[PDB]
Design a protein around this nucleic acid. Structure first.
Ligand SMILES: Nc1ccn([C@H]2C[C@H](O)[C@@H](COP(=O)(O)OP(=O)(O)OP(=O)(O)O)O2)c(=O)n1
Ligand SMILES: [Mg+2]
Ligand SMILES: [Mg+2]
Length: 428
DNA sequence: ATCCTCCCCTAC
DNA sequence: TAAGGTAGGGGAGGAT
């Protein structure tokens, strides 16, 4: 019991063992690598000449499904179909990593705090909190990916995350529904009780939207030609890939608060969209609302090996950071370089460029944030440097990192988060 | 134009 | 209390 503090040599070990976000990142990097290792001698890229169907396949409320299947006996009482269930560490300002669809019927969402969620429950409804079972998440994910491989359906299986894969069938010069059904069935068995939904389309963007539409335990087909207003009407603006909270808020401020993708598509003009959200992103949204992928998104089909090749490496710690003096900070920075250099040597790379980035308490923010041990409201400060030669040397790297911290000049007592980055990685 | 640094955003 | 990580697209503004 009793959490290891940031000035302890084993902070990172203990914090990473508990952070579900760190697992998500680690599992993602490992799946990319596993992809590169398995396809060393496989000719891999899709062409413009190629005709293809995307099957975007994703576990439903993963984590809540798997924590529930693996639950301890003191929750046998529990019932996935009727009870609101979440997976989380605590009881107040503690993130809900995953909630089941009964929880979502009350308005509860994945990154919400437990205290916020319990306000949403009417009288006589009790939130059930399950613990994380990281090993088990990983076992179901393995069963998933081996099951996909074993059916011999796809020309290519792109790992996007621990519970999600984009699968491509190449069609030379009805079936699709049976294939959806087989995949959902075989994954449900190979996994034991877990459910997957499937979006199937001729675009990556439509497949992702079809997936959302399918989503409690179903599949949904939807091609560029099946687009209708009743389809677009069913999606929030941030159901678009690449649109999240800031873009939502900009889209709303520009197009008088459109409430569904349908309302947006009827109101927007390419020009105003670009001026609003960026251009690129605006361009992406534009193409999306016609069912089409932007060029950036497509690189993953036209060259998976490149897109999936890791181009940088870092840690980023924004919880539990509390220091009194620079000695503690320097030692921490040194430990973080030690950790990172073990990773760098494991992937047989060196670095030519480094960044130290930090979160500093805003002038106006309480010294102790509402979230226990949290970073609270902060400003970002970042500085990078080019190394003369690519190296994996501790002395070069740790010294420049401690040097970069002095240049940003954050008093230790104000530090609330810190990131150490190797931008630019050089082979061999 | 283009490139570089310091961010912001999104994903999951 | 509680574990707010991390890769990588992208833009603004200065430097060339
Ligand atoms: N803010 C978030 C979002 C997700 N994850 C974790 C837990 C989720 O179970 C898993 C996969 O994330 P998804 O976005 O796919 O969401 P779910 O699988 O939970 O729900 P859905 O049925 O909407 O796919 O990643 C998390 O910890 N915090
Ligand atoms: Mg999911
Ligand atoms: Mg997912």
């Amino acid at each position: 019991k009793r959490i290891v503090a940031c000035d302890d040599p084993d902070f990172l070990t203990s914090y990473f063992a508990h952070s579900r976000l760190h697992h998500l990142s680690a599992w993602k990097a490992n799946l990319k690598d596993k992809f590169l290792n398995e396809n060393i001698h496989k000719y891999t890229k899709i062409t413009d000449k190629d005709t293809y169907i995307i099957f975007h396949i994703d576990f439903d409320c993963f984590f809540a499904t798997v924590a529930y299947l693996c639950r301890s006996s003191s929750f046998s009482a529990c019932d996935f179909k009727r009870d609101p269930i979440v997976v989380c560490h605590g009881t107040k300002n503690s993130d809900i990593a995953s909630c089941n669809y009964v929880a979502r019927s009350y308005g509860i969402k994945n990154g919400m705090w437990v205290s916020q969620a319990e306000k949403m429950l009417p009288n006589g409804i009790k939130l059930i909190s399950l613990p994380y079972t990281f090993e088990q998440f990983q076992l179901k994910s393995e069963a998933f990916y081996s099951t996909l491989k074993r059916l011999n359906i796809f020309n290519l299986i792109l790992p996007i995350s621990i519970d999600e894969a984009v699968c491509v069938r190449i069609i030379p010069d009805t079936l699709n529904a049976r294939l959806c059904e087989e995949i959902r069935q075989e994954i449900f068995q190979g996994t034991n009780g877990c459910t997957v939904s499937i979006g199937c389309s001729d675009s990556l963007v439509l497949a992702r939207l079809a997936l959302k539409m399918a989503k409690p335990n179903g599949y949904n087909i939807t091609f560029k030609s099946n687009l209708s207003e009743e389809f677009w009407s069913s999606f929030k603006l941030d159901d678009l890939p690449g649109v999240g909270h800031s873009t939502l808020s900009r889209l709303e401020s520009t197009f008088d608060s459109p409430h569904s993708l349908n309302d947006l598509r009827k109101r927007y003009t390419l020009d105003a969209l670009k001026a609003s959200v960026g251009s690129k992103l605006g361009m992406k949204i534009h193409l999306a609302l016609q069912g089409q992928d932007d060029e950036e998104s497509l690189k993953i089909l036209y060259d998976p090996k490149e897109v999936l090749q890791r181009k940088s490496l870092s840690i980023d710690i924004n919880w539990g950071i509390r220091f009194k003096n620079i000695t503690q900070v320097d030692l921490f920075i040194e430990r973080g370089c030690q950790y990172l250099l073990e990773k760098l040597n494991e992937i047989n790379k060196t670095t030519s460029q480094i960044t130290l980035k930090l979160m500093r308490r805003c002038k106006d923010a309480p010294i102790e944030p509402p979230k226990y041990m949290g970073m609270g409201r902060c400003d970002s400060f970042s500085r990078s440097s080019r190394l003369g030669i690519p190296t994996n040397e501790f002395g070069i790297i740790a010294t420049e990192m401690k040097s970069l911290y002095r240049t940003l000049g954050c008093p230790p007592m104000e530090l609330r988060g810190l990131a150490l980055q190797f931008n630019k990685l050089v082979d061999v």
